[PDB]
Amino acid sequence: IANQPVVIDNGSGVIKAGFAGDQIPKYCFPNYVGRPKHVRVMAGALEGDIFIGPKAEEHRGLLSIRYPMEHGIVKDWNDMERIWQYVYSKDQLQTFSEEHPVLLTEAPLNPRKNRERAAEVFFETFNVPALFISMQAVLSLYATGRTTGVVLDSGDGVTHAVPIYEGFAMPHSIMRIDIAGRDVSRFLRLYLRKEGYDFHSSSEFEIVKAIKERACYLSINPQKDETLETEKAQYYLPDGSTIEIGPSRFRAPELLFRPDLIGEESEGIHEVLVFAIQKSDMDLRRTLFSNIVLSGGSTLFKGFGDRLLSEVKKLAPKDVKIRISAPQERLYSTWIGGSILASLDTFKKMWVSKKEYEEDGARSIHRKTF
Amino acid sequence: EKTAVVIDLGEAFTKCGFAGETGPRCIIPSVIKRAGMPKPVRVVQYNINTEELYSYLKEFIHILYFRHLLVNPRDRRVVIIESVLCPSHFRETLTRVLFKYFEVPSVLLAPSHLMALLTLGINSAMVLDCGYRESLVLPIYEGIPVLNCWGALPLGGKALHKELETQLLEQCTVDTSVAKEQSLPSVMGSVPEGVLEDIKARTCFVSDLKRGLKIQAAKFNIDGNNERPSPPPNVDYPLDGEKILHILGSIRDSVVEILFEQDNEEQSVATLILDSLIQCPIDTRKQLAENLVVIGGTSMLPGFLHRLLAEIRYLVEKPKYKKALGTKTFRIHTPPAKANCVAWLGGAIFGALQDILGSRSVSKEYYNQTGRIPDWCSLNNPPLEMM
Amino acid sequence: AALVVDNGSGMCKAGFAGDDAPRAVFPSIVGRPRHQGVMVGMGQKDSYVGDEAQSKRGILTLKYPIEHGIVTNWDDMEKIWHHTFYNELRVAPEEHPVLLTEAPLNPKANREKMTQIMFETFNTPAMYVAIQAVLSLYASGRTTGIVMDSGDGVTHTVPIYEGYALPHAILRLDLAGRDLTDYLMKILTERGYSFTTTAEREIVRDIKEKLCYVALDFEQEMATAASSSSLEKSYELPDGQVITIGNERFRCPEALFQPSFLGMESCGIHETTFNSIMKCDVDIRKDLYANTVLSGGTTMYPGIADRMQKEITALAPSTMKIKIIAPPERKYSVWIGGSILASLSTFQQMWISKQEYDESGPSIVHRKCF
Numbered sequence A: 001i002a003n004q005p006v007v008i009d010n011g012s013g014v015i016k017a018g019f020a021g022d023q024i025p026k027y028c029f030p031n032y033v034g035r036p037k038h039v040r041v042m043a044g045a046l047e048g049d050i051f052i053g054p055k056a057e058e059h060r061g062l063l064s065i066r067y068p069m070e071h072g073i074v075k076d077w078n079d080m081e082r083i084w085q086y087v088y089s090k091d092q093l094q095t096f097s098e099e100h101p102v103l104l105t106e107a108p109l110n111p112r113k114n115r116e117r118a119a120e121v122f123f124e125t126f127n128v129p130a131l132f133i134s135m136q137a138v139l140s141l142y143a144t145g146r147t148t149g150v151v152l153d154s155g156d157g158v159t160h161a162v163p164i165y166e167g168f169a170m171p172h173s174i175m176r177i178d179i180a181g182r183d184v185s186r187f188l189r190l191y192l193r194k195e196g197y198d199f200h201s202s203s204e205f206e207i208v209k210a211i212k213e214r215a216c217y218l219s220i221n222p223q224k225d226e227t228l229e230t231e232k233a234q235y236y237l238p239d240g241s242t243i244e245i246g247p248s249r250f251r252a253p254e255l256l257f258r259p260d261l262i263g264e265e266s267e268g269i270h271e272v273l274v275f276a277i278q279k280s281d282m283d284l285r286r287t288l289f290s291n292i293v294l295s296g297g298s299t300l301f302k303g304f305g306d307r308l309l310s311e312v313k314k315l316a317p318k319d320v321k322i323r324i325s326a327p328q329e330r331l332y333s334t335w336i337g338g339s340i341l342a343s344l345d346t347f348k349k350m351w352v353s354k355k356e357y358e359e360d361g362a363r364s365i366h367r368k369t370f
Numbered sequence B: 001e002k003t004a005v006v007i008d009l010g011e012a013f014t015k016c017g018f019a020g021e022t023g024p025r026c027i028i029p030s031v032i033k034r035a036g037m038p039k040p041v042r043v044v045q046y047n048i049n050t051e052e053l054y055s056y057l058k059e060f061i062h063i064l065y066f067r068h069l070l071v072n073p074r075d076r077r078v079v080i081i082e083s084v085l086c087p088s089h090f091r092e093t094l095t096r097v098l099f100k101y102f103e104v105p106s107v108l109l110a111p112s113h114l115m116a117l118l119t120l121g122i123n124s125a126m127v128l129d130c131g132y133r134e135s136l137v138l139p140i141y142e143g144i145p146v147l148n149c150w151g152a153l154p155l156g157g158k159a160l161h162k163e164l165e166t167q168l169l170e171q172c173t174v175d176t177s178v179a180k181e182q183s184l185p186s187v188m189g190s191v192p193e194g195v196l197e198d199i200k201a202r203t204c205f206v207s208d209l210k211r212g213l214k215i216q217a218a219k220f221n222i223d224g225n226n227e228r229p230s231p232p233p234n235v236d237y238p239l240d241g242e243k244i245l246h247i248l249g250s251i252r253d254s255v256v257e258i259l260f261e262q263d264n265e266e267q268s269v270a271t272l273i274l275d276s277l278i279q280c281p282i283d284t285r286k287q288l289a290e291n292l293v294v295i296g297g298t299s300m301l302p303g304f305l306h307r308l309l310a311e312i313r314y315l316v317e318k319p320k321y322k323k324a325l326g327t328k329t330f331r332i333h334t335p336p337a338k339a340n341c342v343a344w345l346g347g348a349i350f351g352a353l354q355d356i357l358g359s360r361s362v363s364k365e366y367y368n369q370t371g372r373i374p375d376w377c378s379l380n381n382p383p384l385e386m387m
Numbered sequence C: 001a002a003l004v005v006d007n008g009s010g011m012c013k014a015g016f017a018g019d020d021a022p023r024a025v026f027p028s029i030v031g032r033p034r035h036q037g038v039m040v041g042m043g044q045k046d047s048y049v050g051d052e053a054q055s056k057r058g059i060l061t062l063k064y065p066i067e068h069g070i071v072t073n074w075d076d077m078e079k080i081w082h083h084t085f086y087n088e089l090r091v092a093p094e095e096h097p098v099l100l101t102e103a104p105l106n107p108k109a110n111r112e113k114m115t116q117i118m119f120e121t122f123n124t125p126a127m128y129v130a131i132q133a134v135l136s137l138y139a140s141g142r143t144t145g146i147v148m149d150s151g152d153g154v155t156h157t158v159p160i161y162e163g164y165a166l167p168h169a170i171l172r173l174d175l176a177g178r179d180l181t182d183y184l185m186k187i188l189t190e191r192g193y194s195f196t197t198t199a200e201r202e203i204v205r206d207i208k209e210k211l212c213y214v215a216l217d218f219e220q221e222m223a224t225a226a227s228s229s230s231l232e233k234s235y236e237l238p239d240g241q242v243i244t245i246g247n248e249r250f251r252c253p254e255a256l257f258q259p260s261f262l263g264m265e266s267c268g269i270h271e272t273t274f275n276s277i278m279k280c281d282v283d284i285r286k287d288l289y290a291n292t293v294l295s296g297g298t299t300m301y302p303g304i305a306d307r308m309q310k311e312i313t314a315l316a317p318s319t320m321k322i323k324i325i326a327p328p329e330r331k332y333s334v335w336i337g338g339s340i341l342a343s344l345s346t347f348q349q350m351w352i353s354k355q356e357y358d359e360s361g362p363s364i365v366h367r368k369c370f
């Protein structure tokens, strides 16, 4: 069918929907289902027992948030189908899944059952004309508009670094760590309890995320900011109450670059970037240092690029040019990439028809993936 | 050398005593008792102008020492943490009040969950420590306690008072001094905590699960499906004021069902151990399942533990933890010393610790020089050993 | 009175000369705990070694001091020898002379530092380094024939004729047991069962040793494995959790015969033996075909000999008879050779004394190699 493809970014945090014709994702809402906290047996209460996006925002205090996706993996498929049904609703986009094809953004190095089951849903639950899963790192390069470049995509669920040269992705140099934006929010909630502010409810977890997104700076020298007395910047809640964040503001995200401090067995965000480049051939290493691209939402932290550049410079070889070319629209880069890829005439060959899936089987999705 | 001191810390506020195991456990509930104040005042508040606190610890400390225990404080110093999560005040303040008011000649500070295993001879996990608020579950490994699998709930029992004030008010006859049946509210706008407590102290108990659930069915009388059994017999509580508070036998039964409701909320009184085992290394779950330790005054609530375990075991069959963990038993390790007592003892134990104690201790000097005491949560813990 | 101490990257086999089997066999690993600023309990060792590090996997970070048969951390290596001599063997290094083992074509720095430590740190009366491949011939009592001593670090093929080595015919490959473990972790994660941490890596290695076997026909075995679920076996983890390895069971050991899977860009272990024989003299090739020995613990995979026989026979001439020598005790074949050589009265002259070291220097080891 000639009808314009619908790009959907499968973000653990916020799902970004829209058509390949669109310059930006129009529809961006949190990737969770909101149910009432109290188990409602009686009538005259909140009906439907499903609140998605602005409906969840309206009844935020009343509902209980449960994310169906953890570290880019779907735990509850029934909830994810309802979310994808909300993508093809009257509220958002308002179009037939039978008419328009879809472009998905699956995380790298996921289990094969997760990929096969995800495809099954869009062919069995939804009667999609055509489906194509694409790599998040590759799409970012289409968005930026360069073939060569290292893509450090730090998301909410997963952080992964893929080195690609002249449109060739080295599968052996790819590194994936589960310590992402979601974990920093969990660690900040722990630090805020150490400041004396409890966030017991699942609804209060969103306010910890809101605090992080509003006020969270990465210090160049952590010892000087630790020694220096803080201003104790107050944050205002919807109710009107104030919270004094203080030193917890900057000493929380430190675990991204130093996860050994809390006691998490990982390399670190600056380490995974350097190692991923070191795996590549000696000829390309210099070109990869000179061409680094930041992607994902967990790069929007204040003074992120300044700290990262310093940490990479010390590990990287001496007298080498290190250029970290960050776009202004890092958060929305992945979807824009998908829109560009879908817009290309080459995509026409890339996607697999519903009829081909019915005849061939499940294996079809694996062979066409790359 | 003279050993040692033990500090109030929560349900624990009543735990004043000194080492070794023979000490009195002097009951201080702890308040001031300041004359111009409404009394008492609980001086034990976070988020308090520290000054207010300053003057309070000064006075308490002075008091406890002053009178309460023979102390001759310059020779024995111990602070137990029953908190890991204490914010830096007031610890800063506690030290601060030492330190100069109270010249303190090195102090070791230590957590309850470590002082917990001291008694069973176990160096391994799980420790659940429940008492005044906020309940903590913390697997302790041999050796490192592992925070990463860190869990916490109310209550423990502070909220039982709303549940009880409320319910007392939702029952309602007081037989007043004028032989009139009157509303509780309004003869009284409130029920002082000491009443509430007393009532609780002796009246609340935890039911067996098959019927703990019929109690739940009272709430939920669904379409008449109620199978909440007859309650026990009613009680005339004598109430002070020469009032009588009649109590239904049915409240004893309900209050305790807070601990255990399952909303759209997880039934967490009951997990904790389950949400952490899924977090813990597989290579150690083998010890953690099976080897469980429960300390804290609130587990003196009878029948608590019955259910508790049934519940947990119950829950082990919810697929969600089941498929996740596979199964096995749980066995309780328990001291003979009482639940409240284990922190206290593991404070006594610590006098044994004297060869070590002054070493793993934070120096007075240092503190005089920086005054910095390390926190696990600080980017500068100095290496104290530089001194 | 003398000691045999094999310095394997995986396992340390130590004992007295003349003994049948090694007295002390433990993993060559150092486990340091991920300790935070929070107070720890009593009976806490700063650095655990061997069985203790294997028992406390949960908290301890396990770091192998030997990488590809090269000692990266010498300070930790000394702690392995210290535990071996004083604790495991219960013997002073001053009393008995120590026989050591080296891989062929190793960095010269290893022998230089090795001899310095034993004579200076441990103050041993004498020390002699031997080639692992040469020792394995003493275990089999064969002067002629090639050996494929495949370890955890590296694999090497050294052809020796009538007790005379052909140095030009020696071939070294970095592909070894440790790389196979990392490959197995990746493909198990694709199946669903995720293993990331250092402790989990060791658990996957224990799983590998039990299930994994070599297929005679790779394509036919995978085709049959795809069809029927008879090869699929279950494994019980330390936790109650049980796993089904499936087709990946026999897929791991294939990398030895086809390194392209791991991405080594090298010839297979069967091709290395053939290539070495081709570099050898034309006359002695017949005897090398007749005496192809398999040594080390990396050749303990069920049916490796059957696959080797087929592949070598295909490469070798049709008229030539190819005989593979695979004794039941291959694992301890290198150490047994050391025990036999150390026991031999002729070897008594070959020892380098402390006096000889002091007079000559550390360069004496390079002169008395071969």
Ligand SMILES: Nc1ncnc2c1ncn2[C@@H]1O[C@H](COP(=O)(O)OP(=O)(O)NP(=O)(O)O)[C@@H](O)[C@H]1O
Binding pocket: C006, C007, C008, C009, C010, C011, C012, C150, C151, C152, C153, C177, C178, C181, C205, C208, C209, C210, C212, C296, C297, C298, C299, C300, C301, C302, C331
């Ligand atoms: N029965 C088996 N099945 C599958 N793999 C095995 C088996 N036995 C050994 N291995 C593999 O071979 C590797 C090394 O064998 P091992 O038994 O450690 O001999 P080794 O001589 O100690 N190696 P090294 O440490 O270099 O001396 C192990 O780490 C396993 O990966």
Ligand SMILES: Nc1ncnc2c1ncn2[C@@H]1O[C@H](COP(=O)(O)OP(=O)(O)O)[C@@H](O)[C@H]1O
Binding pocket: A009, A010, A011, A012, A013, A014, A154, A155, A156, A157, A181, A182, A185, A209, A212, A213, A214, A216, A296, A297, A298, A300, A301, A302, A331, A334
């Ligand atoms: N301005 C911001 N400052 C700091 N952190 C942010 C900011 N915006 C988003 N984040 C973090 O990044 C997450 C968004 O991740 P996102 O880029 O949507 O992931 P994905 O690529 O999987 O869609 C949020 O949940 C939050 O944790």
